[PDB]
Amino acid sequence: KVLNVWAMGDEAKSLKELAQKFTKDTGIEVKVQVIPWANAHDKLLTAVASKSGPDVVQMGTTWMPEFVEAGALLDITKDVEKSKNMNSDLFFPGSVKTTQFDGKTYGVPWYAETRVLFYRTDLLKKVGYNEAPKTWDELSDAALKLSKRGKDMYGFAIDPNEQTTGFIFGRQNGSPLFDKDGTPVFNKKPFVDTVTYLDSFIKNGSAPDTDLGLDASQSFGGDGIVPMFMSGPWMVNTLKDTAPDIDGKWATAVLPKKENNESSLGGANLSIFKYSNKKDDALKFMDYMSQPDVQLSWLKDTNSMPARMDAWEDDMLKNDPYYKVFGEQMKTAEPMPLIPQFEEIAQLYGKSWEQIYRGGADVQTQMDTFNDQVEALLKKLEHHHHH
Ligand SMILES: OC[C@H]1O[C@@H](O[C@H]2[C@H](O[C@H]3[C@H](O[C@@H]4[C@@H](O)[C@H](O)[C@@H](CO)O[C@@H]4O)O[C@H](CO)[C@@H](O)[C@@H]3O)O[C@H](CO)[C@@H](O)[C@@H]2O)[C@H](O)[C@@H](O)[C@@H]1O
Ligand SMILES: [Mg+2]
């Protein structure tokens, strides 16, 4: 009797609230499950293996190609063309790219995100930076200077389990990641030099080489143990809600540049699980949640980025300092490679990064290994497409 919705993290709390109003408005009962992002990919895999799971699923954009490849998401092309709230034409092209495969559409953008630099304005001033670092050389320099405040003080965080980080920096140094032929180029100089660059922060003590176990207010607030980092909109919301002691002492900025300062485009879509016996009510739910006023309500409350383009004309999105930075960054933000093995490739990058930063492996050598692993994965997939 109940429409099952799987959602993730902090956003799923807003979705649960909205779903309560949906149930009041339509009479359709809805149970929203809240799944940590850390566990979600495994939970999705289990649902696919068992063909049992939710009716509506919040899908991280980077996993769209995987779960379309697996046949787990319903083709909703005809249905979204005929909604006035879910039509692809309303959304940013980069967001739409995460939903469309071989001419068919498999979800509706729910929110977008991109990654920006968060920095303590007061602490950067004290090391001679009146504005955020704007190049790789400046990020390195400021970070190293901030790390000299003390043995347990740092300058910049590199999250070893953040799928986007290595690949963002790689593209900034001109690596396409995969060349025109689909061949991975992780062992070519642009990428190798990127990973050397990131390792430089570990080697010089300016990025922590273990998880310090601090929440954002404890690491970025107070005396600013970690005084620069990269994140998305959800960290503006977190810091506004949890770090009052640094109100007026931090800001965001666009990413520092190397060749370019491109960031990632991510977020989440709403999709219908292929095996659902509630497809009609799933679509009603998605249409309702795509109402522009329903969207803007929760988006602005959480400082989140709409994937719907006309939302950006809203006075807050044009004039709020955080939204100005996100909007600027979004102009050039690109999805991670939209390939069905992305997550597994990212996890492989993670292992290789750990061999380097913790194991002391030579970067070129480890990138040769990693690139071979990736090529092997791609061949393994190709073979499934050639029976
Ligand atoms: O990778 C799948 C999917 O990720 C989306 O990013 C979402 C982000 O998830 C990242 C995670 O963030 C956590 C946060 O969820 C958690 O509440 C706090 C406190 O525990 O810690 C982090 O900040 O970070 C890990 C790396 O450590 C990363 O793997 C996750 O992707 O969570 C945000 C808060 O819910 C979401 O706003 C954000 O969308 C991408 O947007 C999407 O493209 C990816 O497919
Ligand atoms: Mg130090």
Coordinates of C-alpha atoms and ligand atoms in Angstrom, one line a residue:
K1 CA 0.0 0.0 0.0
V2 CA 2.9 2.4 0.6
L3 CA 5.1 4.0 -2.1
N4 CA 8.7 3.3 -1.1
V5 CA 11.3 6.0 -1.7
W6 CA 15.0 5.5 -1.1
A7 CA 17.0 8.7 -0.5
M8 CA 20.3 9.7 0.9
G9 CA 21.8 11.7 3.6
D10 CA 20.8 15.2 4.7
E11 CA 18.7 15.9 1.6
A12 CA 16.5 12.8 2.3
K13 CA 15.4 14.6 5.6
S14 CA 13.9 17.5 3.4
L15 CA 12.4 14.9 1.1
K16 CA 10.8 13.1 4.0
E17 CA 9.2 16.4 5.2
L18 CA 8.0 17.2 1.7
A19 CA 6.6 13.6 1.3
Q20 CA 4.4 14.1 4.3
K21 CA 2.8 17.1 2.6
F22 CA 2.5 15.0 -0.6
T23 CA 0.6 12.3 1.3
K24 CA -1.7 15.0 2.7
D25 CA -2.3 16.5 -0.7
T26 CA -2.8 13.3 -2.7
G27 CA -3.7 10.6 -0.1
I28 CA -0.8 8.5 -1.4
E29 CA 1.2 7.1 1.6
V30 CA 4.9 7.3 1.1
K31 CA 7.8 5.9 3.2
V32 CA 11.2 7.6 2.6
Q33 CA 14.2 5.6 3.7
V34 CA 17.3 7.5 4.6
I35 CA 20.5 5.8 3.5
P36 CA 24.0 7.2 4.1
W37 CA 25.9 8.0 0.9
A38 CA 28.7 5.7 2.2
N39 CA 26.3 2.7 2.1
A40 CA 24.1 3.6 -0.8
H41 CA 26.0 2.1 -3.7
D42 CA 26.0 -1.4 -1.9
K43 CA 22.3 -1.0 -1.1
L44 CA 21.6 -0.3 -4.8
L45 CA 23.6 -3.3 -5.9
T46 CA 21.7 -5.6 -3.6
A47 CA 18.4 -4.3 -4.9
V48 CA 19.4 -4.9 -8.4
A49 CA 20.7 -8.5 -7.6
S50 CA 17.4 -9.3 -5.8
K51 CA 15.1 -7.2 -8.2
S52 CA 13.5 -5.8 -5.1
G53 CA 13.8 -2.4 -3.7
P54 CA 12.2 0.9 -3.8
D55 CA 9.6 2.5 -6.1
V56 CA 11.3 5.8 -6.4
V57 CA 15.1 6.0 -6.0
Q58 CA 17.3 9.0 -5.5
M59 CA 20.3 8.3 -7.7
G60 CA 23.6 9.9 -7.3
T61 CA 24.5 11.3 -10.8
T62 CA 27.8 9.4 -11.0
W63 CA 25.9 6.1 -10.7
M64 CA 23.3 6.8 -13.4
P65 CA 25.4 5.0 -16.2
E66 CA 25.9 2.0 -14.0
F67 CA 22.3 1.5 -13.0
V68 CA 21.0 2.2 -16.5
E69 CA 23.6 -0.4 -17.8
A70 CA 22.2 -2.9 -15.2
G71 CA 18.6 -2.4 -16.5
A72 CA 17.5 -1.2 -13.1
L73 CA 16.0 2.1 -14.0
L74 CA 12.8 2.6 -15.9
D75 CA 12.8 4.4 -19.2
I76 CA 10.6 7.4 -18.5
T77 CA 11.2 9.3 -21.7
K78 CA 7.6 9.6 -22.8
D79 CA 6.4 10.4 -19.3
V80 CA 8.8 13.3 -18.7
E81 CA 8.3 14.8 -22.2
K82 CA 4.5 15.0 -21.1
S83 CA 5.0 16.5 -17.6
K84 CA 5.4 20.3 -17.4
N85 CA 7.7 20.0 -14.3
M86 CA 10.1 17.1 -15.4
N87 CA 10.8 18.0 -19.1
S88 CA 14.6 17.9 -19.8
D89 CA 14.4 21.3 -21.3
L90 CA 14.0 22.9 -17.9
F91 CA 17.3 21.6 -16.6
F92 CA 21.0 22.4 -17.1
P93 CA 22.5 20.5 -20.0
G94 CA 25.2 18.9 -17.8
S95 CA 22.5 17.7 -15.3
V96 CA 20.4 16.3 -18.2
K97 CA 23.5 14.4 -19.5
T98 CA 23.3 12.4 -16.2
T99 CA 19.8 11.3 -17.1
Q100 CA 19.9 10.4 -20.8
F101 CA 21.5 7.4 -22.4
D102 CA 21.2 6.2 -26.0
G103 CA 18.3 8.5 -26.6
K104 CA 16.3 7.6 -23.5
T105 CA 15.7 9.4 -20.2
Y106 CA 15.9 7.5 -16.9
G107 CA 15.4 10.2 -14.2
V108 CA 14.6 13.8 -13.5
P109 CA 17.3 16.1 -11.9
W110 CA 16.5 16.7 -8.3
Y111 CA 19.4 18.9 -7.3
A112 CA 22.8 19.8 -8.7
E113 CA 26.1 20.4 -7.0
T114 CA 29.6 21.5 -7.7
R115 CA 32.8 21.7 -5.7
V116 CA 34.3 24.9 -4.5
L117 CA 37.1 26.1 -2.1
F118 CA 36.1 26.7 1.5
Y119 CA 38.6 28.9 3.4
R120 CA 39.1 30.7 6.7
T121 CA 39.4 34.4 5.6
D122 CA 41.1 35.4 8.8
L123 CA 43.7 32.7 8.7
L124 CA 44.5 33.2 5.0
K125 CA 45.1 36.9 5.8
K126 CA 47.5 36.0 8.5
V127 CA 49.6 34.1 5.9
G128 CA 49.5 36.9 3.4
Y129 CA 46.4 36.0 1.4
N130 CA 43.9 38.7 1.3
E131 CA 41.9 36.7 -1.2
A132 CA 41.5 32.9 -1.7
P133 CA 44.4 31.1 -3.4
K134 CA 43.7 31.3 -7.1
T135 CA 46.3 28.8 -8.6
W136 CA 47.8 25.5 -7.8
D137 CA 51.0 27.2 -6.8
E138 CA 49.1 29.6 -4.4
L139 CA 47.1 26.7 -2.9
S140 CA 50.3 24.8 -2.2
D141 CA 52.0 27.9 -0.8
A142 CA 49.1 29.0 1.5
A143 CA 48.6 25.5 2.7
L144 CA 52.2 25.0 3.6
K145 CA 52.3 28.3 5.4
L146 CA 49.2 27.5 7.4
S147 CA 50.7 24.1 8.3
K148 CA 53.5 25.9 10.1
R149 CA 51.3 27.2 12.8
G150 CA 52.0 24.0 14.7
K151 CA 52.6 20.3 14.6
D152 CA 48.9 19.4 14.6
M153 CA 47.8 22.3 12.4
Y154 CA 47.3 21.9 8.6
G155 CA 46.6 23.8 5.5
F156 CA 44.3 21.8 3.1
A157 CA 42.3 18.6 3.2
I158 CA 42.5 15.9 0.5
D159 CA 39.8 13.4 1.2
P160 CA 41.1 10.0 0.2
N161 CA 37.6 8.6 -0.3
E162 CA 36.2 11.5 -2.3
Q163 CA 35.7 10.1 -5.8
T164 CA 35.9 13.4 -7.5
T165 CA 39.2 14.8 -6.1
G166 CA 41.9 13.2 -8.2
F167 CA 39.8 13.4 -11.3
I168 CA 39.0 17.1 -10.8
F169 CA 42.6 18.1 -10.3
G170 CA 43.5 15.9 -13.3
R171 CA 41.3 17.8 -15.7
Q172 CA 42.7 21.1 -14.3
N173 CA 46.1 20.0 -15.5
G174 CA 44.7 19.2 -18.9
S175 CA 44.1 15.4 -18.5
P176 CA 41.0 14.2 -20.3
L177 CA 41.1 11.1 -18.1
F178 CA 40.0 9.0 -21.0
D179 CA 41.1 10.0 -24.4
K180 CA 38.9 10.4 -27.6
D181 CA 39.3 6.6 -28.1
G182 CA 38.0 5.7 -24.6
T183 CA 41.5 4.8 -23.6
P184 CA 42.4 5.7 -20.0
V185 CA 45.3 8.2 -19.7
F186 CA 45.9 8.1 -16.0
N187 CA 49.5 7.1 -16.5
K188 CA 50.3 10.0 -18.9
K189 CA 52.1 13.0 -17.7
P190 CA 49.1 15.4 -17.1
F191 CA 47.6 13.0 -14.6
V192 CA 50.8 11.6 -13.1
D193 CA 51.9 15.2 -12.4
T194 CA 48.5 15.9 -10.8
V195 CA 48.9 13.0 -8.4
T196 CA 52.4 14.1 -7.6
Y197 CA 51.0 17.5 -6.9
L198 CA 48.3 16.2 -4.5
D199 CA 50.9 13.9 -2.8
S200 CA 53.1 17.0 -2.2
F201 CA 50.6 18.2 0.4
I202 CA 50.9 14.9 2.2
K203 CA 54.7 14.8 2.0
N204 CA 55.0 18.3 3.3
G205 CA 52.6 17.9 6.2
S206 CA 50.1 20.5 5.0
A207 CA 47.3 17.8 4.3
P208 CA 46.5 15.3 7.0
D209 CA 47.6 11.8 6.2
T210 CA 44.9 10.1 8.4
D211 CA 41.3 10.8 9.4
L212 CA 41.5 13.1 12.3
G213 CA 38.0 12.2 13.4
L214 CA 36.8 15.9 13.7
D215 CA 33.5 17.2 12.5
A216 CA 33.5 20.3 10.2
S217 CA 33.0 22.9 13.1
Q218 CA 35.9 21.3 15.0
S219 CA 38.3 21.1 12.1
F220 CA 37.5 24.3 10.2
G221 CA 36.0 26.3 13.1
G222 CA 37.9 27.4 16.2
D223 CA 41.6 27.8 15.5
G224 CA 41.2 26.3 12.0
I225 CA 43.1 23.0 12.3
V226 CA 42.1 22.4 8.6
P227 CA 41.6 25.9 7.3
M228 CA 40.9 25.1 3.6
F229 CA 39.0 22.2 1.9
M230 CA 36.8 21.4 -1.0
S231 CA 33.1 20.6 -0.9
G232 CA 29.7 21.4 -2.1
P233 CA 26.5 23.2 -1.0
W234 CA 25.8 20.8 1.8
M235 CA 28.9 22.1 3.6
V236 CA 27.6 25.7 3.4
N237 CA 24.5 24.4 5.1
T238 CA 26.5 22.4 7.6
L239 CA 28.8 25.3 8.6
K240 CA 25.9 27.8 8.8
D241 CA 24.1 25.3 11.1
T242 CA 27.1 24.2 13.3
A243 CA 30.0 26.7 13.3
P244 CA 28.8 30.0 14.8
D245 CA 32.2 30.9 16.2
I246 CA 33.5 31.5 12.7
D247 CA 30.5 33.5 11.4
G248 CA 32.2 36.2 9.2
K249 CA 35.5 34.5 9.2
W250 CA 35.1 32.0 6.3
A251 CA 34.0 32.2 2.7
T252 CA 33.9 30.1 -0.5
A253 CA 35.8 30.8 -3.7
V254 CA 36.0 29.2 -7.1
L255 CA 38.7 26.4 -7.3
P256 CA 42.3 27.4 -7.9
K257 CA 43.5 27.1 -11.5
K258 CA 46.2 25.1 -13.1
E259 CA 45.5 25.1 -16.9
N260 CA 41.9 25.6 -15.9
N261 CA 39.9 25.5 -12.6
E262 CA 37.1 23.1 -13.8
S263 CA 35.2 21.4 -11.0
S264 CA 32.8 18.5 -11.1
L265 CA 29.1 18.6 -11.7
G266 CA 27.1 16.2 -9.5
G267 CA 23.9 15.9 -7.5
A268 CA 21.1 13.5 -7.6
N269 CA 18.2 12.5 -9.8
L270 CA 14.9 10.9 -9.0
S271 CA 14.3 7.7 -11.0
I272 CA 11.8 4.8 -11.0
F273 CA 13.1 1.3 -10.1
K274 CA 12.3 -0.9 -13.1
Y275 CA 10.7 -3.6 -11.0
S276 CA 8.3 -1.3 -9.2
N277 CA 4.6 -2.2 -9.3
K278 CA 3.8 1.4 -8.5
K279 CA 5.1 3.2 -11.5
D280 CA 2.1 5.6 -11.8
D281 CA 2.3 6.8 -8.2
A282 CA 6.1 7.0 -8.5
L283 CA 5.7 9.4 -11.4
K284 CA 3.1 11.4 -9.4
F285 CA 5.6 11.8 -6.6
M286 CA 8.4 12.8 -8.9
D287 CA 6.2 15.4 -10.7
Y288 CA 5.0 16.8 -7.4
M289 CA 8.6 17.1 -6.0
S290 CA 9.6 18.8 -9.3
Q291 CA 7.1 21.6 -8.8
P292 CA 9.4 24.7 -9.0
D293 CA 8.0 26.3 -5.8
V294 CA 8.2 23.0 -3.8
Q295 CA 11.8 22.7 -5.1
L296 CA 12.9 26.2 -4.4
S297 CA 11.6 26.0 -0.9
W298 CA 13.9 23.3 0.3
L299 CA 16.7 24.2 -2.0
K300 CA 17.1 27.8 -0.7
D301 CA 16.6 26.5 3.0
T302 CA 19.6 24.2 2.6
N303 CA 21.7 26.5 0.3
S304 CA 21.4 23.7 -2.3
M305 CA 21.8 24.3 -6.1
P306 CA 18.8 23.9 -8.3
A307 CA 19.4 21.8 -11.4
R308 CA 16.4 23.7 -12.9
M309 CA 17.8 26.7 -14.8
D310 CA 15.0 29.3 -14.2
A311 CA 15.5 29.0 -10.5
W312 CA 18.7 30.9 -10.8
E313 CA 16.8 34.1 -11.5
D314 CA 15.6 34.1 -7.9
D315 CA 16.9 37.1 -6.0
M316 CA 18.7 34.9 -3.5
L317 CA 20.4 32.8 -6.0
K318 CA 21.6 35.9 -7.9
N319 CA 22.7 37.9 -4.8
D320 CA 23.7 35.5 -2.0
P321 CA 27.6 35.2 -1.8
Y322 CA 27.5 31.4 -1.6
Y323 CA 25.2 31.0 -4.6
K324 CA 27.3 33.6 -6.6
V325 CA 30.3 31.3 -6.1
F326 CA 28.5 28.1 -6.9
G327 CA 26.9 29.7 -10.0
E328 CA 30.2 30.9 -11.3
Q329 CA 31.8 27.5 -10.7
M330 CA 28.8 25.7 -12.3
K331 CA 29.5 27.5 -15.6
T332 CA 32.4 25.1 -16.4
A333 CA 31.6 22.2 -14.1
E334 CA 31.5 18.8 -15.8
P335 CA 30.2 15.4 -14.7
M336 CA 32.6 12.8 -13.8
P337 CA 33.1 10.3 -16.8
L338 CA 29.6 9.0 -17.4
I339 CA 30.6 5.4 -17.7
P340 CA 29.0 2.3 -16.1
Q341 CA 32.1 1.4 -14.1
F342 CA 32.7 4.9 -12.7
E343 CA 32.4 4.0 -9.0
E344 CA 34.6 0.9 -9.3
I345 CA 37.2 3.0 -11.1
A346 CA 37.0 5.7 -8.5
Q347 CA 37.5 3.1 -5.7
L348 CA 40.5 1.8 -7.6
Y349 CA 41.8 5.4 -7.8
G350 CA 41.3 5.4 -4.0
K351 CA 43.4 2.3 -3.5
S352 CA 46.2 3.6 -5.7
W353 CA 46.1 7.0 -4.0
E354 CA 46.5 5.2 -0.6
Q355 CA 49.5 3.1 -1.9
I356 CA 51.1 6.5 -2.8
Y357 CA 50.2 8.7 0.1
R358 CA 50.5 6.1 2.8
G359 CA 52.5 3.3 1.2
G360 CA 55.1 5.6 -0.4
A361 CA 54.6 4.0 -3.9
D362 CA 56.2 5.8 -6.8
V363 CA 53.4 7.8 -8.6
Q364 CA 54.3 6.8 -12.2
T365 CA 54.5 3.2 -11.2
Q366 CA 51.3 3.2 -9.3
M367 CA 49.5 5.1 -12.1
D368 CA 50.8 2.4 -14.7
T369 CA 49.1 -0.2 -12.4
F370 CA 45.9 1.8 -12.0
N371 CA 45.7 2.5 -15.8
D372 CA 46.1 -1.2 -16.5
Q373 CA 43.3 -2.0 -14.0
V374 CA 41.0 0.4 -15.6
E375 CA 41.7 -0.9 -19.1
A376 CA 41.0 -4.4 -17.8
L377 CA 37.7 -3.3 -16.4
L378 CA 36.7 -1.7 -19.7
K379 CA 37.6 -4.8 -21.7
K380 CA 35.6 -7.0 -19.2
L381 CA 32.5 -4.8 -19.9
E382 CA 33.0 -4.7 -23.6
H383 CA 32.9 -8.6 -23.6
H384 CA 29.4 -8.5 -22.1
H385 CA 28.3 -6.3 -25.0
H386 CA 29.7 -8.8 -27.6
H387 CA 27.9 -12.1 -27.3
Ligands
LIG1 O1 29.3 9.6 -4.8 C1 27.9 9.4 -4.9 C2 27.2 10.7 -5.1 O2 27.7 11.6 -4.2 C3 27.0 12.9 -4.2 O3 27.5 13.7 -3.2 C4 26.7 13.9 -2.1 C5 27.6 13.9 -0.8 O4 28.2 12.7 -0.6 C6 29.6 12.6 -0.5 C7 30.0 12.5 1.0 O5 29.5 13.6 1.7 C8 29.4 13.3 3.1 C9 28.1 13.7 3.6 O6 27.1 12.9 2.9 C10 28.0 13.4 5.1 O7 26.7 13.8 5.5 C11 29.1 14.1 5.8 C12 29.1 13.9 7.3 O8 29.2 12.5 7.4 O9 30.3 13.7 5.3 C13 30.5 14.0 3.9 O10 30.5 15.4 3.8 O11 31.5 12.5 1.0 C14 32.0 11.3 0.5 C15 33.5 11.4 0.6 O12 33.9 11.5 1.9 C16 31.6 11.2 -0.9 O13 31.9 9.9 -1.4 C17 30.1 11.4 -1.2 O14 29.9 11.5 -2.6 O15 26.7 14.1 0.3 C18 26.1 15.4 0.3 C19 25.3 15.5 1.6 O16 24.2 14.6 1.6 C20 25.2 15.6 -1.0 O17 24.8 16.9 -1.1 C21 26.0 15.2 -2.2 O18 25.2 15.2 -3.4 C22 27.3 13.5 -5.5 O19 26.6 14.8 -5.6 C23 26.9 12.7 -6.7 O20 27.3 13.2 -7.9 C24 27.5 11.3 -6.6 O21 27.0 10.4 -7.5
MG2 MG 51.6 21.4 10.9

